[PDB]
Design a protein around this ligand. Structure first.
Ligand code: YUH
Ligand code: ZN
Ligand code: ZN
Length: 232
């Protein structure tokens, strides 16, 4: 009823949307992995009379529910989607999107890693993002490669119209006490990559993590702290 949704307020197999700013929503879904339940976030950005989707809802059925929730709450067509790294909470559901007529995009590095690991594979390659600090425009957002962090391929997304920074899983929520799932992370480079984000988006007003509650710029420094301490 207004608060940011958690696993406790999302019906089973359901998706909720949360208005972040004018023409910017996050989407929140729930999924089970290795016997535990987790929330995860993505982004929706108005693209004129179309919508740009950032990341799936972690699963084919979740992502079908996501499209239905978008049509119910927003009513504009999702035409393009970007996956910010190769894990299932970012690409799981790309096959559903592609069959729905959504054009799916990711960096070549993400597409390679998804294919190698048996995850669903976005159709289109996003060039110009292979060196840390690279940035390219994509409809109403800027895509930024900060360097290796939560994964070697993780991208972040900035909505300049609203100064919204979508950090993806390279950014953790403030309540985070751990670095999350670090199976594919580079703990040594992660703080340097967060520093690049901080330097590049100093005017960010909202910071959205890959999982958990949005906040302000403090999420960036907190993420660095938790990752450095995890490594220690
Ligand atoms: C699908 C994703 C995933 C699954 C379950 C939980 C998480 C969390 C997380 C978030 C908060 C928290 O408190 N704990 C855990 C994150 C995260 O931090 O982004 N990712 C999760 N995967 C799977 C995988 C691939 C590898 C295969 N060998 C394992 O590495 C991942 O990042
Ligand atoms: Zn991940
Ligand atoms: Zn994640």
């Amino acid at each position: 009823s207004g608060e940011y949704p958690t696993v406790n307020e999302i019906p089973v197999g359901e998706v909720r949307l949360y208005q972040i700013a004018d023409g910017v929503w996050s989407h929140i879904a729930t999924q089970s992995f290795d016997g535990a339940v987790y929330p995860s976030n993505g982004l929706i950005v108005r693209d004129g009379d179309e919508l740009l989707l950032i990341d799936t809802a972690w699963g084919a059925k979740n992502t079908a529910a996501l499209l239905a929730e978008i049509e119910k709450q927003i009513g504009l067509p999702v035409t393009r989607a970007v996956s910010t790294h190769f894990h299932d909470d970012r690409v799981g559901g790309v096959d559903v999107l592609r069959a729905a007529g959504v054009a799916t995009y990711a960096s070549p590095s993400t597409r390679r890693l998804a294919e190698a690991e048996g995850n669903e594979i976005p159709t289109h390659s996003l060039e110009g993002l292979s060196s840390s600090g690279d940035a390219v425009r994509f409809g109403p957002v800027e895509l930024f490669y900060p360097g290796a962090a939560h994964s070697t391929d993780n991208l972040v997304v900035y909505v300049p119209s609203a100064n919204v920074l979508y950090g993806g899983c390279a950014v953790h929520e403030l309540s985070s006490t751990s670095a999350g799932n670090v199976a594919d992370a580079d703990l040594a480079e992660w703080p340097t990559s967060v520093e690049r984000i901080q330097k590049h988006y100093p005017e960010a007003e909202v910071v959205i993590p890959g999982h958990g509650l949005p906040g302000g710029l403090d999420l960036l420094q907190h993420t660095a702290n938790v990752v450095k301490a995890h490594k220690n």
